């Protein structure tokens, strides 16, 4: 009975034994998300279990962003996104991405937002987002992928 909720003030989650495969995303959980190093620039959402103490098996961070020509236009950027090994290969990684766009879509209804940016550190992450329809940018921006808000509109309208 997994659910997606926002990491609130408390952070009262059981993160003991969390492991996504990449230690950088693990240490970011124990040393930043667990200390509420967020709320003003980074906003975290969490994939949590239905246990009596909810366990965290995934998370992502979102931040308001803007892209410029060098005009200026606002956007949203998905920073980190991690899925615990226990629940990998089950589609939760793409469901979190679907929940990201849902928040972008919800945010776009109140403020102007033209799309969703993501930075692909390695080439597996690049293949992961390219598979979901993200458009990869070129040269200096070759490790950024973009998905427009109007495509997000089609995805939840139709569903």
């Amino acid at each position: 009975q997994l659910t997606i909720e926002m990491i609130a003030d408390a952070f009262s989650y059981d993160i003991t034994g969390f492991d996504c495969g990449e230690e950088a995303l693990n240490t970011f959980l124990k040393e930043h998300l667990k200390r509420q190093h967020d709320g003003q620039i980074l906003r975290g959402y969490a994939l949590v279990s239905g246990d009596t103490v909810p366990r965290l098996l995934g998370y992502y961070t979102l931040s308001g962003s803007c892209f410029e020509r060098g005009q200026n236009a606002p956007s949203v950027t998905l920073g980190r996104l991690a899925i615990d090994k226990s629940v990998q290969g089950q589609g939760w990684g793409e469901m979190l991405v679907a929940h990201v766009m849902r928040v972008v879509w919800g945010a776009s209804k109140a403020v102007g937002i033209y799309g969703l940016f993501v930075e692909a550190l390695n080439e597996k992450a690049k293949a992961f987002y390219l598979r979901l329809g993200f458009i990869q940018l070129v040269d200096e921006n070759s490790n950024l992928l973009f998905y427009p808000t109007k495509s997000i509109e089609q995805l939840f309208t139709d569903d």
Partner: protein, 82 residues
């Protein structure tokens, strides 16, 4: 001013901070807070500002004006969300 930051550091780092603060006519706390917060604003500004070249900018404009329809895998992920 109700927050706080506690630090452990080497004798070397403490010494050069003490002497650079004295040179700058600043307390240790002023020198350290100013150095960290000014550097924080740099990290934060690089995190939100996507400086796009003209080809990348055109790809974004193409995605905005001519938005693709979501593929089968992406729609399938949104149905499990719902």
């Amino acid at each position: 001013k109700k927050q706080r930051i506690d630090l452990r550091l080497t004798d070397d780092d403490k010494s050069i901070i003490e002497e650079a603060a004295a040179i700058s006519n600043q307390t240790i706390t002023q020198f350290v807070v100013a150095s960290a917060s000014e550097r924080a604003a740099e990290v934060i500004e690089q995190h939100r500002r996507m400086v796009l070249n003209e080809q990348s900018w055109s790809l974004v404009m193409e995605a905005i004006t001519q938005p693709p329809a979501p593929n089968d895998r992406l729609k399938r992920a949104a149905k499990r969300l719902q």
